[PDB]
A paper describes a structure:
The osmoregulatory ABC transporter OpuA protects Lactococcus lactis against hyperosmotic stress by accumulating the compatible solute glycine betaine. The SBD of OpuA, hereafter named OpuAC, belongs to a superfamily of proteins associated with ABC transporters involved in solute uptake in prokaryotes. The structures of OpuAC showed a fold typical of SBD's, having two α/β domains that enclose a ligand-binding site when in contact with each other. OpuAC is highly specific for glycine betaine and the related proline betaine.
OpuAC was crystallized in the absence and presence of 1 mM glycine betaine, yielding an open conformation (space group P41212, diffracting to 1.9 Å resolution) and closed-liganded conformation (space group H32, diffracting to 2.2 Å resolution), respectively. In the open conformation, the α/β domains had moved by 25° relative to one another when compared to the closed-liganded state. OpuAC belongs to Class II of the proteins in the SBD family, with two connecting segments forming the hinge, of which the central residues are Lys404 and Ser508. In the open conformation structure, electron density was observed in the binding site, although it could not be unambiguously assigned to glycine betaine. Electron density was observed in the ligand-binding site of the open conformation structure. This density could not unambiguously be determined, but likely represents endogenous ligand that was co-purified with the protein, as ITC and fluorescence titration experiments showed that the amount of substrate bound per mol OpuAC was below 1. On the basis of modeling and refinement of the ambiguous density as glycine betaine, the initial coordination of the quaternary ammonium moiety would be performed by W377.
Numbering used by the authors: 320 to 575
Write the structure that this text describes.
Amino acid sequence: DKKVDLVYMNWDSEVASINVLTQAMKEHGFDVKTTALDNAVAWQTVANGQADGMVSAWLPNTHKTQWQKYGKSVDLLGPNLKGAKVGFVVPSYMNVNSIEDLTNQANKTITGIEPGAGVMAASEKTLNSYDNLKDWKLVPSSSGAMTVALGEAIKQHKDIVITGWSPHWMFNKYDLKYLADPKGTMGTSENINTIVRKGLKKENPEAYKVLDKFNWTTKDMEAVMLDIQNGKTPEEAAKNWIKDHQKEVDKWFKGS
């Protein structure tokens, strides 16, 4: 009679993690309910005990507002994935290795995404902080347009500098690298965390123990995300990843 009620928000990262955790918990005999909700709504359901938890708490910056409102009302168990970040990214075949080393590559353009995006604010700050970038231009478009442009550039061995972020399937599809950011204007890393309702440890110790132990890496998430980007259903992408990492998955369901 094991059960668990999980909520997530509909981002490609979370679709990957929530299907792996769902398929894993089903395989270990849980009745699993999962529902996608708006970000603020998902947090409130966990804070009020309407849902058992979420594995989609991005801290400290991305969900800063929600953590300020609800953090003291939930149990933060800890990180399930470490090292999410943003930065300038280039194909690995380009020589440059640091943002301070850019000069005239790629038509002095940073190929960006939606104008309102957090990586885009950081990119603007970055262009106004590094002396060598004074004549460079941030060109917004969309996430889809950026990845199309990345693909075409790599196909033709052309220079391109994009506003990249991780985890993301592009790092599995292509051979890319982040440019060093010695001034730190592209920010520091975040972790994705697990939060549960306060009554869980006592009322549902079976689910609590699993959520407490759930963890995987940026490369694992990127592998699942690439399968989905290539047409596999999230359920099949997840089952395939689980099969290949059975030892790692089984760890979430045993031990003190």
